[PDB]
Design a protein around this ligand. Sequence first.
Ligand SMILES: [Cu+2]
Ligand SMILES: [Cu+2]
Ligand code: NA
Ligand code: NA
Lengths: 619, 619
Amino acid sequence: ASPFRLASAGEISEVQGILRTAGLLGPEKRIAYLGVLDPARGAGSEAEDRRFRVFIHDVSGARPQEVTVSVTNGTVISAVELDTAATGELPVLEEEFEVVEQLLATDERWLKALAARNLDVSKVRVAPLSAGVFEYAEERGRRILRGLAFVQDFPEDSAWAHPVDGLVAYVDVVSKEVTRVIDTGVFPVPAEHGNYTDPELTGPLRTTQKPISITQPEGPSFTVTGGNHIEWEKWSLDVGFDVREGVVLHNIAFRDGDRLRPIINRASIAEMVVPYGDPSPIRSWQNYFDTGEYLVGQYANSLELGCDCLGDITYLSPVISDAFGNPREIRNGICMHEEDWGILAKHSDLWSGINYTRRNRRMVISFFTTIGNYDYGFYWYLYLDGTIEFEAKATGVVFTSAFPEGGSDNISQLAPGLGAPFHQHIFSARLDMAIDGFTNRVEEEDVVRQTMGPGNERGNAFSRKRTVLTRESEAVREADARTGRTWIISNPESKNRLNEPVGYKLHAHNQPTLLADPGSSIARRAAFATKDLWVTRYADDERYPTGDFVNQHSGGAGLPSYIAQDRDIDGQDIVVWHTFGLTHFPRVEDWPIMPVDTVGFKLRPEGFFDRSPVLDVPA
Amino acid sequence: ASPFRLASAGEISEVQGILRTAGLLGPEKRIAYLGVLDPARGAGSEAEDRRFRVFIHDVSGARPQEVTVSVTNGTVISAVELDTAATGELPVLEEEFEVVEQLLATDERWLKALAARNLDVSKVRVAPLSAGVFEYAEERGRRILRGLAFVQDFPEDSAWAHPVDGLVAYVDVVSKEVTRVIDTGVFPVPAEHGNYTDPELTGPLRTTQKPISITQPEGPSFTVTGGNHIEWEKWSLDVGFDVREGVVLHNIAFRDGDRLRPIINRASIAEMVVPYGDPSPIRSWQNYFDTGEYLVGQYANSLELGCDCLGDITYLSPVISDAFGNPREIRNGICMHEEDWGILAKHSDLWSGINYTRRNRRMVISFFTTIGNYDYGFYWYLYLDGTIEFEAKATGVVFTSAFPEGGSDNISQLAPGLGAPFHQHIFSARLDMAIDGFTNRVEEEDVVRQTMGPGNERGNAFSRKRTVLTRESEAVREADARTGRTWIISNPESKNRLNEPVGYKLHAHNQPTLLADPGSSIARRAAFATKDLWVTRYADDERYPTGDFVNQHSGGAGLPSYIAQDRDIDGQDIVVWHTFGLTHFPRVEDWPIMPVDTVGFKLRPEGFFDRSPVLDVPA
Ligand SMILES: [Cu+2]
Ligand SMILES: [Cu+2]
Ligand code: NA
Ligand code: NA
C-alpha cells in the first residue's frame, strides 16, 4: 500500500474510462492536466480513496472543466465548468506546439513577412510562446499563443542560431485565427550555425580524459520499498511525481534513536518563471511559467545510465496521462543514488593525541526536463548530518534574437549579429513544514551589531535577534545578506534536551528577485517572485504561488490572495514558500550550448538534535 | 629547472648553513618563518637566482631579524633588525605552545585560582593564545601569550568539554614571567565529556553504509612534471606551498587553441582571522589570525588515502623548516585528484531531434590544517568550462566557555552548563591577476532596474552597469547582494572575436563581513575584513592584507596603508583581495565535534573565450 505511492498505468486508464463513460471525454476534449490528489489532513485511520484531479480542455472552445475522480469507486466526485476569462486559461498542450507554425504558414501577412526576408516557409520554425495579459482587448476570453520565428537550414540544424527578429505573430489556437502579425523591421538573420555536434564547431575531440569508475560492490545503502518509499542513513521519505511539479518529496523524517521525527511534510518546486528584460515589442511580453503554463514534469527526460546518472543508480519510471487519457511511462525519469561528499568532520587534537576523520555522503533524487530551448535538472539532496538541500541546474540553448547595430542595454551579443536577451529564471519552493509535527512557526534571524560602550568596552561584541512571524500579513519577507538573515522553522511545543524549541534554519542564496517594474503585468502575475520568503497557513487548495490556471490570468492569484486572509501562523500548520532565482546576462561562453549554472537553498538542523547526529558514522 | 618548483630539503639546509655561516643562527636563534621568494617581475628573464626569506626569533630577547639569502650564491642578500614594539612580533612558535601551561603551573596566583575551584593543576591544559594589542602598558616590548584553561580528566579526554571560565592569565614567554592572572569568579566547569570516539556518546556504530568504490583504471587525466607542475584538460599551473599561507597556486593558465592564456599569476589565502564576539573580559581580547599569527602551513596534516582523500590521488610532500633550520617533510600534505562533477551541458531539441549530454569534471588541489581546537580544509578547484573556485571547509571542536545561568546574548549553549561564544572565521584571498597577461582592470557590475515609461512601456526592462575602478582610493568595495553585484577583471588590450575586452567574473557568497565596532582593536588590526573587495597595484613587498608581522601588531600596515598610495589600476598589473567569511552561532549539532561548514568564492569566464570552450569534450 502506502497512500503516497506513484500513479500506476492502471489508475490513469481508470480515470480515462470513468471520464469517458460519464460523457466528459468526447472527441473534442483533451487532458490538459492530470495528477493524484494528496491525502487530506488527519484522515489517517481511513483506507485509501485514490482520487485524481483533471483539467479538461475543449478544442471547440465550449467550456473546459476541472474534474475530480475517485479511482477506487469508479466515479466522478465533481466536475466544475471553467470560466477561463475569469480564472485563467488551461495549460498549454504538447499538441498545440505545432499549431502556431501551421496556422501561420498560410497567413498572407506571415508569408509576406517571410518573403520580404527571403525565407522559405518550409524552413521556418515557430516557437509556441505563452501570451500573458497586456493591452490587447480582443484577447480576453480568447486562448492565445504567440509565435517567434527561427530558421532551420536542414533537418538536424539548431534553429536557435537563426532567429528572425522584428517579427511576431499572435494566434487563437481554438478559433484557428491569426489575430495579429507585427513586423517592426527586417533584421538580418544571424548567419553562423550553432551546431555543437558539428566537427567544424567542436574541432578535434579531446582524447585526454581518462575514465572514472564509480561502483558499489555490495549495492547502495538505501532501500526502496512500496515502489517509492526510501530509507537511507536514518532518513525516511516518499518520492512522488506530478506532471506539473515534477518530483515532489513527501513525509521527510529522520530516525533519532527510537522515534521517526518528521521534518517536512511535502516539498516541491511549485512554480518557476522566466521573465525577459528586453523592451523591444517583439519580446517585451515574454514570461514563461514553465511549471504553471507548460508543466515541467510532462517533458521529463529518460536518463541514460553512465551519462545522465553515473554510479549505482535506482530508477523510478513515473507514468503520466497523454492528451487522450492514455498512460505514458517516462522510462528512467527519476534517478536515485548516494554519493561520497568529502569530509564530514575532522579533528587532530594537540592534548589527547587522537586523530579523527569521518566522510560525508548525500542521497540524491533528481530528474531533468526540457521546455523548448531550456533544459533544467532538479536535484534534492539529503546529507548525513540532517541537512536538506535543493538545487536547480539550468542548461540548454539560450533564447536568441538579433543583436542590433550599435548595441543594446538589454541584450548580449553571442556571435556576429546574434543576440541573447537578458532574463531571469525564478523558482518557488513550497515547503509544507512539519518540524517534529505540524505545530510550527517561523522566525526571522538577523545578525545584530553592537556599539562599543558599557557592556562592550572593547567593541568586539555581536549578537543576533529572532522575530516570530505571527500572522500572514507580516510574513512576506525579503532577504538581507548584509545582516546574514535566515529563517528558522521551529516547533514551540517540542523542546531539545537544553529545553529549546527544536528547529531547521533555511539558508538562501540571496540572489536578486524579480527585476521588473512593480507596475508591470509580470510583477502582478508572478508576485511570488518579488519577495524571497512567504509563510502561509496550510490549506488544501492553496497549491501554487501563482494559482491553478496561470495561462493568461490578469494578476494577484496565489500567494498575494492567500496572504490577504491574514491567518494565525504562530504555532500552526504552516507552509513556507521560498523564492530563488538566476539573473542571466548571457555570455559568449553560453553559446552555442550553455554550461550548467546553478541556484538553490538549504535547510540545516538548528537545535533539532541533542548533539551531533553523526557520532555513529564509522571510519 | 622550474623557477616555480617547491622548496627542497637541501634548499632548507642550505639556508640554515648560510645563516649559520653569517653569524645569524647561533644557539639562541629560531626560525619563526621561512619561505621561498617568488621571482620579481620580468624575471626568469632577469637572473634566476633562488632566494629565501626568513624571520629569525631570538630566545634571549635581543631584536629578531628578517633576512633574505640566495641559496645558489650562498650569500646573505639583506638582513634587518626588527623593532617588534613598532612593526609587530614574530609568528608564535610551535615550541612556545607548552610554555604558557608550564610557567602557570608554578605561579602562586594561578595555583590559588585553581584551588578555589577544586582543580588538580596536573589536569589543567592551558591554550596558548595570541595576545593582540589592548590596554596593557607592561606589554609594550614584550612577547606575550594569553592562556585559557580546560580540564582534561585523563590522557585521551577532550579538554574542550571542560572550560574553566572566569580565569585568564598573561605570560611573557621570553622573560618567563606571568604578568597578570585575572579571576572574575568561580564558574562551574561543565561536567559532560565530549569524547566523540567513546561508545557512551557514539552509541553502536551504523552498519548500514555500503562502500563506494572510486577508481581510475587507466590512471588520472592530469600529469605532474618538474615535481609540482600540473596540466589537466587545458589547464596549466604550478602548485606551491608556503609555511604561512599553505597551498599557493602559480601561473594559472588555460590552453585555448595554440596559445597558453594566463588568467591568474598567483592565488593564495593571504590571511584568515577568527574574531570572538563575547564581551566577557575572559574572552573579549580573542582574535586568532591562524594564517598571520600561527602559520597554517606548519600544521598541514598528513592526509590518508581513503579517509582524507578518496579516489586516485597524487600527493605532494612539501618541505618546511623546523624552528632550528632543519628540513621537515610534510608527508602527503597536499592531495591532487580529478573528480566527476555531474552534468556540464545538456539539450534535447524539439526541432532537430538531437539529444546531447556532456559531464563536467574538476581538478582538486587541497590540504587540511589543525590550529588548536581548529581544523580547516583549503580546496582549489578548476572546472572544464574555465571556472576557478576556492572552498574553505571549517570543522574541529568549537571553542567553549561556561554557559551563564540566566543565558547570554553572545554565547550558545551546547550541553548543560557548556557555552560556545559567537565568532566569525574570515578569510582573505589574494589574487594576483593576469587576465590574458598583466594589463588588467576591475569593473564593478551591478544589475540596473528600469522604470516603466517611454522606451520601456511594459515595465519589464532590466539592464546592468559597469564601473571601472581607476585608482586604489576608489577600489575598496562592498558586496551588494540585492543588485547582484559582481566584479569583472578584464584586459582592455585583449579583445574576443566580438571586439569586447576578455574577462573573468568574481562571484562572492555575500556573507557578513567583520561585525566588530569600527573603533575596536580588531577592526583596525583586521581592517581588510571590514570590506568585501579591494584592488591594489602589484608591488613586491605587498604580500599580506595584514602586513608581515601580525602578532601583537597595531594597525598601520597592510591593505589600508597600500591603498593610500592611490596608484593607477586601470589597465595595469593588479591584485584583487577578496574578503569572505562564516558567521558562526554555534548550535547543539556542532557539539562535541563539528560537521563541516563551507564558504568560498569563484571566478567564471566572462567573454574570455569566443564561444563555449567545452564543445570538444567527448561523450
Ligand atoms: Cu538563462
Ligand atoms: Cu566557528
Ligand atoms: Na505544515
Ligand atoms: Na597582476
